[PDB]
C-alpha cells in the first residue's frame, strides 16, 4: 500500500465505474456478455446481456471502490500517525 498508488487505482476505478454505468443505460435504451460467445463457439438478447453486463460491471467497480476507500483512510490515518511519531522521536532525542 501507498497513498499515491491507492489514490491512483481509486480515481481509475471511479472513472471506469462512471463509464460502465453510462453504457448500461445506452444498452438499456437500445461487449455483450456470453452472447457472441455462445453462438460462435457453437438484438433483444444482445441488449439484454449488455444491460446485465455493464450493470454487474458497474456494481463490481463500486464494491471495489468501496473497498479501496476504506484502505484509503486506514492508510491515510497510518501515514499521519507515522509522520507524527517520527517528528516526536527526533524531539525526544534532543
Amino acid at each position: 500500500a501507498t497513498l499515491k498508488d491507492i489514490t491512483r487505482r481509486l480515481k481509475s476505478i471511479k472513472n471506469i465505474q462512471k463509464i460502465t454505468k453510462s453504457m448500461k443505460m445506452v444498452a438499456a435504451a437500445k461487449l455483450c456478455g456470453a452472447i457472441h460467445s455462445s453462438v460462435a463457439k457453437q438484438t433483444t438478447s444482445e441488449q439484454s446481456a449488455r444491460m446485465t453486463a455493464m450493470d454487474n460491471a458497474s456494481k463490481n467497480a463500486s464494491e471495489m471502490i468501496d473497498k479501496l476507500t476504506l484502505t484509503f483512510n486506514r492508510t491515510r490515518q497510518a501515514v499521519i500517525t507515522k509522520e507524527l511519531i517520527e517528528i516526536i522521536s527526533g524531539a525526544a532525542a534532543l
Binding site: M25, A28, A29, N73, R74, R76, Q77, T81, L84, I88
Partner: protein, 466 residues
C-alpha cells in the same frame, strides 16, 4: 492565596504559589488586566509551581505579575436569568445586555451522575417532528448526531426542537457554540430572536446561549461545551426538567482538546489526536443522561474528518450516540422539509422492547417502502413506468404519499412561510403512516400529504384541492 506568574509560553502559563497551592482545574484570576483573564489549573509541576491554560490572550503577561486563586474551578451564572442571554466561556455576558443577575453559581467541572442516580428505563423524547419521532426517535437523555452541513434547514430544525420540547415538555434549552464563527453566531442570535425562542423584552426565552468563538484560544474553545453543559445541568438537577443541549460541532470540541493537549506538550495518539481523546469525550458526554430528577438530551452537530467515519474523532463520538439526524440537500431540493433523510437517519432505541412493537413495525414499513421505491427508480426511468404490476404501481404511489407526509411545517417558519406550524404527537404520526401503508388513503392526491400536520389535515387538504 496569591501566586506570581513565572512562566508564559503562548496559551500556557505556569504560576508559583508560595503557600497554598490551587488544585487541578481551579480557576486563577490574573491581576492587572483590562478584561478578565482566567487561567484554569492543569498540572502541579512541583516546587509550589502549577501549570495552566489561559482562557483568553496572554499578551501583556509578565513574570511576577500577581495571580489569584479563586478557590474553586470556573464558576458561571446558572438559573432562569441565563435564558435568552449569550454567555462567555467563563460566565460573562457577551450580549452586552449588562449583568446576568443570578443568585446561583456553579463549577464547569462536575463528575457525572453516579451509577445509582441512573435511569434504567428507555423512554423516547417526543419532538413532534414526524420523521424524527417515527424513523429515528431521540432517546431522552441520549445524544443525537446531527448530520448536514449548511443550507439544509439546520438552524430551523434546531429552534423548532427548542420550541416543541418547550411546548410539550416544559424544558428549556442551551446552545453551546463550540468553535462558532462570530459571524454565524451573530446570525443565529437574531434568527432566533425573530423566531420567538429568544425575547429581548418579556421573559419568554426558551434557550440559553453559550459561545466559544474560533478567535478564542484552544483552552477557551475546549471548556465551552462544559460551561454550556453546567448551565443545562441546573435545569435538570434544580428544576427537574428534561432539558435539551445543543453542541454545534462536537468535533471542534475534540480538536479543541488536541490543541490543549499539544500545547501542554503531551504525546499525540493515532492520527494526531490527544491520548485522552476517549476520556475527554467521556467526562463530558457522560454528564448527559437521564437522572431520577429529570434528564438532558443533546443534539450535537458532527463533522466527519476526510469523510472518514473511522477517523478517531467521530468514531470516539459514535460510542456516545443513540441517534443520528441526517440532513440532505438531495431532500432539501425536492422541497421536502425538514430535509431529514428518512433512510440514513437512525436510532438505537428503535427497538420493539423500547418503542413498542406497534411503533416499530410502522417505522420499519416506511423504511422498507422507501427502500423499495428508491430501487424502482431505475426501471421507472429506463424500462418505463408502464409495465409496473399492481404491487409495483401502489408502492411508488404510496411511497410518494409517505415521502411527502414526512414533510412538516415548522412553527418557527410561520414568520416567513405564512403557514401555522404543526406539532404532531407520536400517536398521530404512527397511525398516520400506519394507515397510508394499509392503503386506506390511496384515493387521494399526493399534494394532500405534503406540508401538513396530523393525518387529518391530509384529507381536509385533499378535498379543497379536489
Amino acid at each position: 492565596t496569591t501566586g506570581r506568574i513565572v512562566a508564559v509560553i503562548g496559551a500556557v502559563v505556569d504560576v508559583q504559589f508560595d503557600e497554598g497551592l490551587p488544585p487541578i482545574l481551579n480557576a486563577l484570576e490574573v491581576q492587572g488586566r483590562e478584561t478578565r483573564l482566567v487561567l484554569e489549573v492543569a498540572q502541579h509541576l512541583g516546587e509550589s509551581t502549577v501549570r495552566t491554560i489561559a482562557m483568553d490572550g496572554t499578551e501583556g503577561l509578565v513574570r511576577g505579575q500577581k495571580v489569584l486563586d479563586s478557590g474553586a474551578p470556573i464558576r458561571i451564572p446558572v438559573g432562569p436569568e441565563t435564558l435568552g442571554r449569550i454567555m462567555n466561556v467563563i460566565g460573562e455576558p457577551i450580549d452586552e445586555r449588562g449583568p446576568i443577575k443570578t443568585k446561583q453559581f456553579a463549577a464547569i467541572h462536575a463528575e457525572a451522575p453516579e451509577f445509582v442516580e441512573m435511569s434504567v428505563e428507555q423512554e423516547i423524547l417526543v419532538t413532534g417532528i414526524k420523521v424524527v419521532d417515527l424513523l429515528a426517535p431521540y432517546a431522552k437523555g441520549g445524544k443525537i448526531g446531527l448530520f448536514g452541513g449548511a443550507g439544509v434547514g439546520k438552524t430551523v430544525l434546531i429552534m423548532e426542537l427548542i420550541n416543541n420540547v418547550a411546548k410539550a415538555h416544559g424544558g428549556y434549552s442551551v446552545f453551546a457554540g463550540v468553535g462558532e464563527r462570530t459571524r454565524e453566531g451573530n446570525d443565529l442570535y437574531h434568527e432566533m430572536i425573530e423566531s420567538g425562542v429568544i425575547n429581548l423584552k418579556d421573559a419568554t426565552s426558551k434557550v440559553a446561549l453559550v459561545y466559544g468563538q474560533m478567535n478564542e484560544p484552544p483552552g477557551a474553545r475546549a471548556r465551552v461545551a462544559l460551561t454550556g453543559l453546567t448551565v443545562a445541568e441546573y435545569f435538570r438537577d434544580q428544576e427537574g426538567q428534561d432539558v435539551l443541549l445543543f453542541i454545534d460541532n462536537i468535533f471542534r470540541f475534540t480538536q479543541a482538546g488536541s490543541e490543549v493537549s499539544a500545547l501542554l506538550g503531551r504525546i499525540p495518539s493515532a492520527v494526531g489526536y490527544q491520548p485522552t481523546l476517549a476520556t475527554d469525550m467521556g467526562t463530558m458526554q457522560e454528564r448527559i443522561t437521564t437522572t431520577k430528577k429529570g434528564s438532558i438530551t443533546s443534539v450535537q452537530a458532527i463533522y466527519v474528518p476526510a469523510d472518514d467515519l473511522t477517523d478517531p474523532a467521530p468514531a470516539t463520538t459514535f460510542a456516545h450516540l443513540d441517534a443520528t439526524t441526517v440532513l440532505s440537500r438531495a431532500i432539501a431540493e425536492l422541497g421536502i422539509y425538514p430535509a431529514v433523510d428518512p433512510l440514513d437517519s437512525t436510532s438505537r432505541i428503535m427497538d420493539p422492547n423500547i418503542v413498542g412493537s406497534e411503533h416499530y413495525d410502522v417505522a420499519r414499513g416506511v423504511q422498507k417502502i422507501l427502500q423499495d421505491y428508491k430501487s424502482l427508480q431505475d426501471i421507472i426511468a429506463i424500462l418505463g413506468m408502464d409495465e409496473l404490476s399492481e404491487e409495483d404501481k401502489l408502492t411508488v404511489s404510496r411511497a410518494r404519499k409517505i415521502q411527502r407526509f414526512l414533510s412538516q411545517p415548522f412553527q418557527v417558519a410561520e414568520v416567513f412561510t405564512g403557514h401555522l406550524g404543526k406539532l404532531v404527537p407520536l400517536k398521530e404520526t404512527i397511525k398516520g403512516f400506519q394507515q397510508i401503508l394499509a392503503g386506506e388513503y390511496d384515493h387521494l392526491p399526493e399534494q394532500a400529504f405534503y406540508m401538513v400536520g396530523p393525518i387529518e389535515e391530509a384529507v381536509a387538504k385533499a378535498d379543497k384541492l379536489a
